[PDB]
Structure formats: structure tokens, C-alpha cells
Ligand binder design. Sequence first.
Ligand SMILES: Cn1c(=O)n(C)c2cc(S(=O)(=O)N3CCC4(CC3)CC(NCc3ccc(-c5ccccc5)c(Cl)c3)C4)ccc21
Length: 329
Amino acid sequence: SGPVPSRARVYTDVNTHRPREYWDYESHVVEWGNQDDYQLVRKLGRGKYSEVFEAINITNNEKVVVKILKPVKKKKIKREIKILENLRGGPNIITLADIVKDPVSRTPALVFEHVNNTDFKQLYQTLTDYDIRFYMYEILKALDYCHSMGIMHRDVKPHNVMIDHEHRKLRLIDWGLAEFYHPGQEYNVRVASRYFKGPELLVDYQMYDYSLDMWSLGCMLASMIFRKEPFFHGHDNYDQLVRIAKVLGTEDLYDYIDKYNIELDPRFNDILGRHSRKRWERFVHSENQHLVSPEALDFLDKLLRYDHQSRLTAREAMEHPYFYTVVKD
Ligand SMILES: Cn1c(=O)n(C)c2cc(S(=O)(=O)N3CCC4(CC3)CC(NCc3ccc(-c5ccccc5)c(Cl)c3)C4)ccc21
């Protein structure tokens, strides 16, 4: 009789109540701007689906970031553009400024607002407990916004977060895997980077929702507070879930698969074994202690749950005591 269905606990019906054009991205028509408005200055990054450059708009001498896509399906270009346009002006969401057709690749190039980006040497070294809480709050602002606007990011990870520490500014980037949440929809589980994949992806439960991003956030927090990047260090997708189970325990895992009547790939029964749920104190040492507090562990514990329906929402996360000092200020 197959897997038990699931719905988001929050922002369930938000896309239903919008006009079709908001989420029916296949009907979105893309208008091109002038590629010659932009001169490329230097390469910043190269990343599987795209290359990223710093550029100058010669029309007005503004500095800009250009993301030249590798060949992708038109429908996925339209989804990313549509989501970027829908979320534009929202808290800590990267701003799409223009879309042009590259003369060499004949592929699209997305043009973004420039955000100055501080080295991961200056940061991650005298990044204080306060700083982690502050920037986590800022990420939660972006996720609560995008979730409220009917959109899961599905690729939350440090590579997709930019911080300008001089200006205490943060941006969530790389919306190319984001999707619109619709109740009853089965999504592709072949998303996210392995270290950040939620258990639902790993056990092939397709009827997932915004709560996927909350697992990913949990991975990032763990990694920051225990100074262990990545926290769940799988050697492949099967072992990824073994790494998770060596911490969260197998008991809650088997309960999760029972509740949703999930069919476990029999590969997994050779390898999952039996494991205790571990106390978070086993990952605390003197070299990470200043980042770890009762309220951080309580928060982390409530993000990293197998059952996606039982993880904090972005809003609930923002209300957690971990953040009382940052909200006060
Ligand atoms: C505007 N624009 C775009 O749209 N794209 C695609 C673009 C691509 C580029 S890039 O390639 O030069 N490149 C920029 C540098 C990074 C990698 C990417 C490193 C990553 N940030 C790491 C990070 C992330 C999170 C944290 C953190 C700290 C505390 C609490 C929570 C989290 C900390 Cl401590 C660090 C950002 C540039 C502009 C772009």
C-alpha cells in the first residue's frame, strides 16, 4: 500500500492561494538585456552548473556579479529566474539585477548585485559565539521568508551563504535547486550535497517540504559549534545515513521508516546496524567549548530529527533562547 503521505505543517497552501503564474514557471517568458552592458573583470569561482565572474556595468559604472550557466534545461533556468524574481527584495535574498545571453556560451548569464565577501581566514578565526548566533539568525530570516513565499531552497550549505562582515550583511545565494512547495507533490531526492542531505532524501521519501532546509541548517550549526566540517562525513549516500545514525541512533531511524511505511533499499540493512543515540557532549572539546552552550545544543537537537514533521520551523527556530541576545540587539 506504499509510503504514507505528508504535508508541510506551515505555509502549506501558500502557492495554491497565489495566481498560477507565481509558481507555474514553465509559462514564464524570459526577456534578455544587453550583454554589452557588462564587461567581465575577473573570474571568482567555477561550480559544476556555472562560472561566476566579477563584472562592470559600463552603463553606470556599478560593480556586478555575473553567473554564466553551463547548458541546463530551459525549464530549470525559468524556475531559478522565477524564484529569484518572486523572492527579490526579501530579507537576505540575493538580488537578481539582469539576465543576458552570453555571446560565447550562447547560454544565459544571471547578473547579480555585488556583495563584498570576507575571506574564510579572517572569518572562522575569532568568529565569536555571538557572531555565529547573529549570522544564524540572518540565515533564518531568509529561510522563513522563502518558506512563507512557498519555496524550498534545497541546497543550504556554507558555499551558498555570503557574509560581508564589515557591514554585518548576509545573503543566501544559488537558487538553482530551489522549488515551489505544493501539498502532495513528490520531488526529486537527488538534490543537495551529500554532507547536507536530509534523511528523507537518503531513504527515498519524495513527499518532503521546507523542513528539508532545516536539517541542512542543523548540519551547518553542528559543523560550526563543534568545529568539524563536515559534521556527517559520509563516504557515499548509503554511508551518509550510517554517519547520521551513529549520532542520532538507529531506534528513531527505524521508527521514522515505520511511521511513513518507507521501503528501505536492502543495501541499508547490511550496513545500518544498531546504534545508540549519542549525547552531544562527546563532540565537545576545549578547542570548541567557547561556541557550545546548553541553548546551542538544545537548538541543534531540535533541528536534527529524522522525522521532518518534528524539526523546528524557521519561525520556531528564530524564537529559540539561543537567539535571545541577538533579538534584544
Ligand atoms: C553574488 N554571487 C552569486 O550569486 N554567486 C553564485 C556568487 C559566487 C561567489 S564566489 O564563487 O566567489 N564564492 C564567494 C565565497 C564563498 C563561495 C562562493 C565562500 C562562501 N561563504 C562561506 C561561509 C558561509 C557561512 C558562514 C557562517 C558563519 C557563521 C554562521 C553561519 C554561517 C561562514 Cl563563516 C562562511 C561564499 C561570489 C559572489 C556570488
